Ligand binder design. Structure first.
Ligand SMILES: [Mg+2]
Ligand SMILES: [Zn+2]
Lengths: 653, 1319
DNA sequence: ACCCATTCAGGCATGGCTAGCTGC
DNA sequence: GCAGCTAGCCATGCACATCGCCTGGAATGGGT
RNA sequence: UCAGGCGAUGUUU
């Protein structure tokens, strides 16, 4: 190549060929004059080793140096390795029609559509644009229309909308660990320069918004559009092929919302008044007569589909809370009202979404997810759940507890100083007693938080669960847990030392009060251990996934029924301790192999070629048979593939 | 008391401990190191003096012609720093050396024939160090990062466990010399000792023993003890050291002169041994049929015949006993051997020996060091005597010798710089001692086995490499030379010296491209301590222990400030108080404790010294009298903390900061944060970017002043005095009287640096921060720099924040910002790009820079002058034409603003190689720069000459004045005066002669300056003139930028609301940012809430003063209120007697407080909740720190209080319009017809291996077949696809990927044959 | 002399192998 | 006095995208 | 438009 100016960047090939060719010409020469044998042997040996270089430098003892200081790249290196063709331009390659940018939030999107920048789009779809232009005749040829788009005149944006209208794109996030990390969307055009991405999918991508980036690809051909519309648009992956558990699991803000939205206090404005329907419950909460969570009676009407596909209504006076009804105005038709009566933590809201799925199908579930999100964000903000120093409460007994523990420490110290115990059990004694004190303080703080609020009922006093913002964000399951709320209020326990031994003086102080220096400095290597670990962890795991996919590649479900009577056996796992995995969830959805006889023999309970779904598992529980044979892919008897029935349910459908 | 600028805005300071040792000068590492590398110092000892005096004298092959050293010198540079950056040459210095060449009388005693001393042969250029610690290599500004490696010395490691699975441990012992060849000893699971050299193979250790000309008998004597047997009456009675039995259970009777102590079989008790040693009874009879299971000491040949009886170190048997008792060797010596205390290790290894003599040993060594050669005897002799004993190719330093003798419990600390028999043997003894069960392995993290080099060490060493590369050639020419017909400066050729030292300062795993976007970034990057680079471990071998933080980092190397990701734990920053010991171990301050009093006597300590003493801790309540107020205290003793008695302590910490680096001691309330988030906070702080309008930080930590002043990015005054002329360009200070030199001194002049490029494309800029007619003290600011204010560090801005979830727009971490922010331009950064346009005269012709262009008319050419280059000022955009360049045909090789990058041209440079013309605009800018140089340097000298006329007319005035004799005539009548003929007339006459000389001097100076500015310096070969243009974008803030606190809460700004819709509070002010509370519990950084509350208190004090001052109130009220605010707090060291300012001097202070009374918080001695509350209540805000906020949309109270306050946020520099990118179709690559990669090159993404797996997982296959055929590789199909697209039909045509076709051609180029079959 | 003739050290795991290596 | 074993020596490999920024063939010796 | 260095980025649970 002609680099900047006149010089030419030497290419290792050109170099090595040039060397072998010089060597060869000299050797032809010396065989035109019958020169002596020592010389010809030297020449031949040099030539052999130069060709060795050309083919595979570095393999014969010491490599030949490069033009500067460093081995130069031969053909074998041009094939193999992390940077040869097979891994740099065949398996995965670069791609026109694409772009990349930063992501942001945009919580106004139905979950089957994503933001997309304007500039970035008009630069993506330039072809389809040229088309529609000279179709409407607003131009002459390519070059004229190219001037058009360059100008960005008043028409191009309208036509850009016209071709966006329905045309899926693919969003992708950089380290794509697994299938769900490439999905589809329909574009909505936006100003700015940041891809706006629906929020119920951040979980799947594993994409916080601390400055991550996403790539957009366009599908061109018609088959491909139908692809992104039938196999990859977010409304067709609401089960993870890993394990059939939902993946649209709502997340932090939205659950804090619903939570604070549905939870009884004991005495707020509007007590005991009776209401004629979710509608006027909402109308109260708006004009400000009743409060968002006040024990109340209402008339609600629920539908149940007991008939063979028919929806029967029934009404009654439930006892509930205003906010809880206002939630009810969303839930689709056929779900029992007892689904939103309880506190609505994170687990519970997931349960709600999933039952809605199993019963009403798909479209209701998607639309109901989007409404969860809207109403959630809305009432969260309308709550205003902050966090401030005054809301991390110190147990007033912490000082006493820890002083008492200190005294016991000193007592063991004396029993050793007079020489009555071995350092071994001394060490063990101290560590145990600190652990005990730790647990006592943790009990104390958790108590004083959870019951803190104590208020009057139009009577005298009464105690209820609290409204302490940090306790709330930890009881909803939004963020944190008992562990971390502990580390904010009560002592933060014992901290390891680099080796694995465990230092014998706990960090008596929490994060609200300060930390004197030495305490902090221990906590350091406590944390750096893991933080430095995580990187090497990443690398090695990537390598693992690679090898796995390169051994399980060819395997495609080809035939339909191998028709065999082998199989493996299934019993629930028991590890000396309590049973760990129930036989139900090890046998959910996996074709049986031999008819499972009722323990009363000659009482055939199930056929041999059934598809054990939930109800059949229930039957198994009924007769309580607990050793079932079943067909497993390791036994199927099909050439060059794997028969359908031997592979069971397809999780994600 | 206060330095007169502090009296402007005196920062209030919580904090309880008295500080005794102020923050030291933050660049000691760099500055002392280089000042040491390059400085005339006698007696060798670490300088170029050391280097030369080592390598010289050079003597011929006994030809009695010799070359020797004298001295050396360093001329002043051929430029200065600023001109140097602007042009591009290095900031170098010439190197002169005085050499002396002598020859003795041929064929005679030492008759000195001749000694010519070539005056200062020139041997190259070595860069210098700017007063900021940065080198300047090619127009850019680079930094060398101190390296951390293993102390040249000796070591005893375990490698416990993991090897051989046998549960058995090894014990290897290494010698790592400073320069030469390593050496290792190690065991093997059969207790067999083995030496190895340079990691090559294994050898039986006794081989190198014997190689050091030792006979087997000497060897056994040296290692093992002895056991004496006599052929007495019978049974050959034995001498017995009683202790020698305690480990060995007996199998025969144990008596004493018949008096039996034990009978056959049992072990021995120490009581018995004591009895025996009391008895002295040792010469005892032994069962003879037992000793046969032992080993002989020496060779007992016959007294008479001397036959081949017994080889030393051989087993025994009664037949051999008789074979020797034939002559009756009445003395037999054997080797004491325990199998628990003292083992037969060396004996067994000696048995495994292949060789038996010195010569064979040397042969074996030669053969392992060189594969495949018949060894010549003396050749191998040379090879061995040249690896471990020759001054040339092996060298410990003083450092090595110290650490070595220390490890061996030797006496001294000085000694030779090469090994010795004594040494190798002693090492082996120590190793054996370990395997026996005394002593302990060291470890390789303890900071007594790990050491800091620096720029000095490096450059010195590389320069030494230079000298040896030159001495070989010099010695050659001298050997093949002749009689003095050539002077010295022709022997030596400097090109190798220069080339090597340039290789170093220009291309190293160390010398790197200084981060510069930010004061704090400079001052971190210069204090960095890397473990990489030559002589160090690398990012794929480092295990886990070097990455963990060993418990001697305390107070020497930060725990927290460090990158995350690949190279964690290898880029240790360096603590505040840290210093470098004499030898080079990190050492820290401490306070000396006598019997019961905490002195104020500082005292430095290294790593290992600290082990023995017992150390206090920073925050230990001591009371007024050097007494700890308690009687038992927390302390740390030997990598262990505990509680100790009041009387055992010896040393107390210095201050409370010393455990962290200046990376993360700017983090208010640090101690309320998890290590993790403090870490990410330190880093993001390092990546700030100067804003447009700097602003003090409302909640700082008293280190801002240090970082700012003691970095180099602000104009500090050098001599106290009075300002005389201010301007955005320069500041001119009239020095005071006494600080002035006696001789015609004058005044001082600082050239502030107006807008110019930084190495990260951000802007750098300076502003005056003092007004006309005003005092300044020595050592003081006179110009804020990028991200500074009145001399404090200021990275971001303080905005009013409110924590509450708000309609989803702040979902994960997405800050939401109100248009008030973007309107007032308080994040509007400034950037600058530097394009380029060069011109080489080539074959086929030259290249002029005219403005003549086909395909476009004046409609585009307008913005160019008739000379071609762009006017300074035109708002250019993407596609405009900055320079008109033409190439001989004519072909257009012009220069255009690349797409996207807006601009506004601010400056144009033009270089030209000396020997070419200067075209029209060259001439224009040329004479402009002449006028510039004139009105700059000449005009400088003109105000200087004005002040000088004042000084010498005062020589005519002050004293025996001529008032009327002098006011009439202008200031020109001074030379030939006849006045009082005393010292005043003498001064007149002689100094006026001197002054006409000074007129000539003025002239010659200016002429030299013109001469410089006229010379057209060097370029790349083959180029004529270079034109450079600069542009200045200006970036606002917009959905996508990454904002960040100081506590490690990142966040991508995600919408820009109108003012109506923020949450406003009952008094009307909106709130400017809205974060997300859910982010506090999990990431357990409860710190940012305390920051917020204290901030709100600050702005409370502010608004109060603001009102009091707007009402135009009297001053009594202000003194009272300000006084109160500075006085509250429990018991602080701050103490301002506000009643000693001038009434005017207060109104000014209020003027600078009305934005908010800044507050301190020394890192680990912060402000407590109690004092935060009391400060708020001094204000008028609610104690809890939570307000009620309404809501811009519905105007109805949020249902419970929220937290609002002020917080200091920073605009990190991953600007979104730098990230975003798109591509439809464009440049394709060349070898494999795929698209390119990157942004500049208009490329596309990388549909990588993992994405392809994903697509395969979905059933989709057309998407994949497409993205591997049409979007990328098939040429034919690619174009046909595009065509169908524009026609309205969507359909593809697969074809075959050209890259695969390439794979075919290459494999086919090998011998292999690869085809495509047929169907 | 200038731009071109002929040439120039902190792995670890495993595994796969080669050369002794002492049961027989 | 041959063969299964055991011990040293070399081959192989060790995440994915960015983005920058630089930095980059001479090396003697020759003919006008 | 081709190969090394560095740094950053992100992958924090
Ligand atoms: Mg992230
Ligand atoms: Zn099957």
């Amino acid at each position: 190549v002609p680099l900047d100016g006149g010089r030419f960047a030497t290419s290792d090939l050109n170099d090595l060929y040039r060397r072998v060719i010089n060597r060869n010409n000299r050797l032809k020469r010396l065989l035109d004059l019958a020169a002596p044998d020592i010389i010809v042997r030297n020449e031949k040996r040099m030539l052999q080793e130069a060709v060795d270089a050309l083919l595979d430098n570095g393999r014969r003892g010491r490599a030949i140096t490069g033009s500067n200081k460093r081995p130069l790249k031969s053909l074998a290196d041009m094939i193999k390795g992390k940077q040869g063709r097979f891994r740099q331009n065949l398996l995965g390659k670069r791609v026109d029609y694409s772009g990349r940018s930063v992501i942001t939030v945009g919580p106004y999107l139905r979950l089957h559509q994503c933001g997309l920048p304007k500039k970035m789009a008009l630069e993506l779809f330039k072809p389809f644009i040229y088309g529609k232009l000279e179709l409407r005749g607003l131009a002459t040829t390519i070059k004229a229309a190219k001037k058009m788009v360059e100008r960005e005149e008043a028409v191009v944006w309208d036509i850009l909308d016209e071709v966006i209208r329905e045309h899926p794109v693919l969003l992708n996030r950089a380290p794509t660990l697994h299938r769900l990390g490439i999905q589809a969307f329909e574009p909505v055009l936006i100003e700015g320069k940041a891809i706006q991405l629906h929020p119920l999918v951040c979980a799947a991508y594993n994409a916080d918004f601390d400055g991550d980036q996403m790539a957009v690809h366009v599908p061109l051909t018609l088959e491909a559009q139908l692809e992104a519309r039938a196999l990859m648009m977010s409304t067709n992956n609401i089960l993870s092929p890993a394990n059939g558990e939902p993946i649209i699991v709502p997340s932090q803000d939205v659950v804090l919302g619903l939570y604070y939205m549905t939870r009884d206090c004991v005495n707020a404005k509007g007590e005991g008044m009776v209401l004629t329907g979710p509608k006027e419950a909402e109308r109260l909460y708006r004009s400000g007569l009743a409060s968002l969570h006040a024990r109340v009676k209402v008339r609600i009407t629920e539908y149940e589909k007991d008939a063979n596909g028919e929806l029967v209504a029934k009404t009654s006076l439930k006892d509930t809370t205003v906010g809880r009804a206002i939630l009810w105005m969303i839930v689709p038709k056929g779900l029992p009202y007892s689904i939103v009566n309880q506190a609505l933590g994170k687990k519970a809201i997931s349960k709600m979404l999933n039952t809605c799925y199993r019963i009403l199908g798909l479209k209701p579930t998607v639309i109901f997810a989007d409404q969860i999100m809207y109403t959630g964000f809305a009432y969260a903000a309308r709550s205003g759940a902050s966090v401030g120093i005054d809301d991390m409460v110190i147990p007033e007994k912490k000082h006493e507890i820890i002083s008492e523990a200190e005294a016991e420490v000193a007592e063991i110290q004396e029993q050793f100083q007079s020489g009555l115990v071995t350092a071994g059990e001394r060490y063990n004694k101290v560590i145990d007693i600190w652990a005990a004190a730790n647990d006592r303080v943790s009990k104390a703080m958790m108590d004083n938080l959870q019951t803190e609020t104590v208020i009057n009922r139009d009577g005298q006093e009464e105690k209820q669960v609290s409204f302490n913002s940090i306790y709330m964000m930890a009881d909803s399951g939004a963020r944190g847990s008992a562990a971390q709320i502990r580390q904010l209020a009560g002592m933060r326990g014992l901290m390891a030392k680099p080796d694995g031994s465990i230092i014998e003086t706990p960090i008596t102080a929490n994060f609200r009060e300060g930390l004197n220096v030495l305490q902090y400095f221990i906590s350091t290597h406590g944390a750096r251990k893991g933080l430095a670990d995580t990187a090497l962890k990443t690398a090695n795991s990537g390598y693992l996934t690679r090898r796995l996919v390169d051994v399980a590649q060819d395997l495609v479900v080809t035939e339909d029924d191998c028709g065999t009577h082998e199989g493996i056996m299934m019993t629930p796992v028991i590890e000396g301790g309590d049973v760990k995995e129930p036989l139900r969830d090890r046998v959910l959805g996996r074709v049986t192999a031999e008819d499972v006889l009722k323990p009363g023999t000659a009482d055939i309970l199930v056929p041999r070629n059934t598809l054990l779904h939930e109800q059949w598992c229930d039957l198994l529980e009924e007769n309580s048979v607990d050793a079932v044979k079943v067909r497993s892919v390791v036994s199927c008897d099909t050439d060059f593939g794997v028969c359908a029935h031997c592979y069971g349910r397809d999780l994600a459908r | 008391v206060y330095s007169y600028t502090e009296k402007k805005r005196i920062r209030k300071d919580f904090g309880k401990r008295p500080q005794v040792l102020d923050v030291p000068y933050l660049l000691s590492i760099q500055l002392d190191s280089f000042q040491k590398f390059i400085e005339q110092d006698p007696e060798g000892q670490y300088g170029l003096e050391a280097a030369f005096r080592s390598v010289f004298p050079i003597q011929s092959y006994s030809g009695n012609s010799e070359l020797q050293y004298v001295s050396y010198r360093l001329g002043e540079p051929v430029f200065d720093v600023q001109e140097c950056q602007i042009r591009g040459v290095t900031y170098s210095a010439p190197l002169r050396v005085k050499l002396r060449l002598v020859i003795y009388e041929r064929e005679a005693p030492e008759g000195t024939v001749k000694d010519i001393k070539e005056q200062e042969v020139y041997m190259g250029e070595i860069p210098l160090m700017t007063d900021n610690g940065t080198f300047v290599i090619n127009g850019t500004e680079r930094v060398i990062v101190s390296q951390l490696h293993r102390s040249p010395g000796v070591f005893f490691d375990s490698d416990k466990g993991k090897t051989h699975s046998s549960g058995k441990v090894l014990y290897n012992a290494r010698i790592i010399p400073y320069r030469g060849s390593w050496l290792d000893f190690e065991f093997d699971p059969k207790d067999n000792l083995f030496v190895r050299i340079d990691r090559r193979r294994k050898l039986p250790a006794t081989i190198i023993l014997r190689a050091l000309n030792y006979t087997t008998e000497q060897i056994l004597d040296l290692f093992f003890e002895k056991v004496i047997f006599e052929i007495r009456d019978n049974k050959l009675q034995m001498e017995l050291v009683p202790e020698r039995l305690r480990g060995e259970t007996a199998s025969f009777d144990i008596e004493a002169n018949g008096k039996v102590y034990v009978e056959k079989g049992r072990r021995i008790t120490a009581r018995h041994i004591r009895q025996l040693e009391k008895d002295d009874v040792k010469l005892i009879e032994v069962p003879v049929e037992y000793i046969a299971g032992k080993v002989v000491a020496k060779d007992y040949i016959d007294e008479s015949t001397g036959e081949l009886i017994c080889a030393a170190n051989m087993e025994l048997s009664l037949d051999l006993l008789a074979k020797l008792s034939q002559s009756g060797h009445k003395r037999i010596e054997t080797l004491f051997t325990n199998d628990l205390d003292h083992g037969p290790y060396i004996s067994e290894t000696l048995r495994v020996d292949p060789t038996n003599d010195r010569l064979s040993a040397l042969v074996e060594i030669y053969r392992m060091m060189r594969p495949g050669e018949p060894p010549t005897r003396e050749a191998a002799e040379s090879l061995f005597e040249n690896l471990f004993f020759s001054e040339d190719r092996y060298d410990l330093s003083a450092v090595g010798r110290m650490k070595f003798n220390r490890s061996l419990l030797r006496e001294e600390i000085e000694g030779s710089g090469i090994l010795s028999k004594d040494d190798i043997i002693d090492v082996m003894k120590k190793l054996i001692d370990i395997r026996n069960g005394k002593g302990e392995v060291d470890d390789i993290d303890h900071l007594g086995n790990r050491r800091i080099r620096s720029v000095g060490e490096m450059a010195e060493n590389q320069f030494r490499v230079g000298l040896v590369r030159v001495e070989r050639a010099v010695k050659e020419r001298l050997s093949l030379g002749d009689l003095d017909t050539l002077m010295p400066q022709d022997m030596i050729n400097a090109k190798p010296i220069s080339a090597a030292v340039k290789e170093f300062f220009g291309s190293s795993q160390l010398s790197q491209f200084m981060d510069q976007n930010n004061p704090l970034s400079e001052i971190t990057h210069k204090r960095r301590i890397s473990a990489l680079g030559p002589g160090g471990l690398t990012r794929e071998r480092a295990g886990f222990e070097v990455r963990d933080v060993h418990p001697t980092h305390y107070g020497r190397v930060c725990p927290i400030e460090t990158p995350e990701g690949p190279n964690i734990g290898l880029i240790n920053s360096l603590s505040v108080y840290a210093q470098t010991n004499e030898y080079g171990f990190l050492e820290t301050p401490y306070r000396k404790v006598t019997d019961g009093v905490v002195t104020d006597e500082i005292h430095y300590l290294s790593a290992i010294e600290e082990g023995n003493y017992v150390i206090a801790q920073a925050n230990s309540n001591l009371d007024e009298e050097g007494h700890f107020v308690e009687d038992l205290v927390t302390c740390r003793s030997k990598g262990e903390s505990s509680l100790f008695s009041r009387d055992q302590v010896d040393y107390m910490d210095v201050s409370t900061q010393q455990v962290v680096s200046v990376g993360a001691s700017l983090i208010p309330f640090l101690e309320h944060d998890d290590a993790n988030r403090a870490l990410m906070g330190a880093n993001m702080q390092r990546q700030a970017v100067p804003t447009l309008r700097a602003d003090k930080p409302l909640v700082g930590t008293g280190m801002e002043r240090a970082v700012a002043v003691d970095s180099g990015v602000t104009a500090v005054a050098k001599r106290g005095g009075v300002v005389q002329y201010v301007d955005a360009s320069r500041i001119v200070i009239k020095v005071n009287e006494d600080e002035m030199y006696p001789g015609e001194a004058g005044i001082d002049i600082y050239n502030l640096t107006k807008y110019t490029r930084s190495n990260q494309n951000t802007c750098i800029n300076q502003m005056p921060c003092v007004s006309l007619g005003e005092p300044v003290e020595r050592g003081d600011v006179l110009a804020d720099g990028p991200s500074t204010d009145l001399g404090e560090l200021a990275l971001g801005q303080n905005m009013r924040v409110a924590f509450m979830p708000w309609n989803g727009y702040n979902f994960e971490d997405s800050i939401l910002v109100s248009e008030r922010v973007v309107q007032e331009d308080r994040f509007t950064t400034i950037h600058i790009q530097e394009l380029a346009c060069v011109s080489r005269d080539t074959k086929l012709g030259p290249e002029e820079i005219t403005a003549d262009i086909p395909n476009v008319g004046e409609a585009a050419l307008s913005k160019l002058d008739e000379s071609g280059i762009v006017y300074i000022g035109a708002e250019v955009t993407g596609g405009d034409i900055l320079v008109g360049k033409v190439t001989p045909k004519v072909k257009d090789s012009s220069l255009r603003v690349p797409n996207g990058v807006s601009g506004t041209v601010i400056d144009v440079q033009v270089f030209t190689r000396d020997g070419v013309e200067k075209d029209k605009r060259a001439l224009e800018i040329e004479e402009m720069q002449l006028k510039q140089a004139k009105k700059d340097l000449s005009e400088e000298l003109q105000i200087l000459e004005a002040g000088l006329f004042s000084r010498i007319r005062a020589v005519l005035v002050a004293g025996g004045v001529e008032a009327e004799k002098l006011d009439k005539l202008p200031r020109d009548r001074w030379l030939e005066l006849g006045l009082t003929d005393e010292e005043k007339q003498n001064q007149l006459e002689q100094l006026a002669e001197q002054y006409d000389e000074l007129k000539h001097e003025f002239e010659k100076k200016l002429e030299a300056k013109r001469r410089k500015i006229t010379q057209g310096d060097d370029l790349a070969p083959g180029v004529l003139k270079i034109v450079k243009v600069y542009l200045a974008v200006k970036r606002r803030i917009q959905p996508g930028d990454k904002m960040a606190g100081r506590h490690g809460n990142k966040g991508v700004i995600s919408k820009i609301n109108p003012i109506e819709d923020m949450p406003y509070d009952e008094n009307g002010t909106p709130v400017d940012i809205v974060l997300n509370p859910l982010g506090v519990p999990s990431r357990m950084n409860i710190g940012q809430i305390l920051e917020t509350h204290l901030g709100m208190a600050a702005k409370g004090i502010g608004d109060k003063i603001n009102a009091m001052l707007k009402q135009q109130q009297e001053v009594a009220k202000l003194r009272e209120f300000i006084q109160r605010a500075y006085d509250l707090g429990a018991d602080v060291r701050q103490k301002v007697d506000l009643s000693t300012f001038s009434d005017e001097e207060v109104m000014r202070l209020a003027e600078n407080l009305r934005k908010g009374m800044p507050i301190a918080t020394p890192v680990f001695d912060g402000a407590k909740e109690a004092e935060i509350k009391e400060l708020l209540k001094l204000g008028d805000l609610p104690t809890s720190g939570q307000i009620r906020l309404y809501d811009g949309r519905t105007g109805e109270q949020f249902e419970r209080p929220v937290t609002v306050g002020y917080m200091y946020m920073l605009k990190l520099n991953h600007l979104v319009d730098d990230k975003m990118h798109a591509r439809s179709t464009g440049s394709y690559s060349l070898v494999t017809q795929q698209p390119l990669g990157g942004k500049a090159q208009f490329g596309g993404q990388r549909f990588g291996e993992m994405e392809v797996w994903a697509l395969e997982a979905y059933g989709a296959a057309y998407t994949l077949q497409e993205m591997l055929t049409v979007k990328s590789d098939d040429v034919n199909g690619r174009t046909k696809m595009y065509k169908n697209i524009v026609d309205g039909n969507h359909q593809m045509e697969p074809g075959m990927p050209e890259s695969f076709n390439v794979l075919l051609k290459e494999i086919r180029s090998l011998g292999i044959n690869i085809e495509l079959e047929d169907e």
